[PDB]
């Protein structure tokens, strides 16, 4: 994108239809890491795990 980085072409899991659990800001930076691990219980795509990672 113009101001967005969706490097999903190198993202095997995106082709599989994998969901992102990161916000725009974190996905553009850690897209590959943001697919790991997908939560198989409460799939909350609006909940950013990388933002929640910076708890301290
Ligand atoms: Zn991806
Ligand atoms: Zn985030």
UniProtKB/Swiss-Prot annotation:
Modified residues (Phosphothreonine): 44
Subcellular location: Nucleus; Nucleus, PML body; Cytoplasm
Transmembrane annotation, as ranges: none
Tissues where this protein is expressed: High levels in spleen and peripheral blood leukocytes, much lower levels in tonsils, thymus, prostate, ovary, small intestine, and colon. Very low levels in heart, brain, placenta, lung, liver, skeletal muscle, kidney, and pancreas. Not detected in brain, liver and muscle.
Protein induction: By gamma-interferon.
Zinc finger (PHD-type): 8-54
Modifications made to the protein after synthesis: Phosphorylation at Thr-44 promotes binding of PIN1 and subsequent isomerization of Pro-45.
Protein purpose: Component of the nuclear body, also known as nuclear domain 10, PML oncogenic domain, and KR body. May be involved in the pathogenesis of acute promyelocytic leukemia and viral infection. May play a role in chromatin-mediated regulation of gene expression although it does not bind to histone H3 tails.
Additional remark text: This antigen is recognized by autoantibodies from patients with primary biliary cirrhosis.
UniProt subunit comment: Interacts with PIN1.
Protein name: Nuclear body protein SP140
Source species of the chain: Homo sapiens
Lineage: Eukaryota, Metazoa, Chordata, Craniata, Vertebrata
Gene: SP140
Part of the full-length chain shown: 687 to 738 of 867
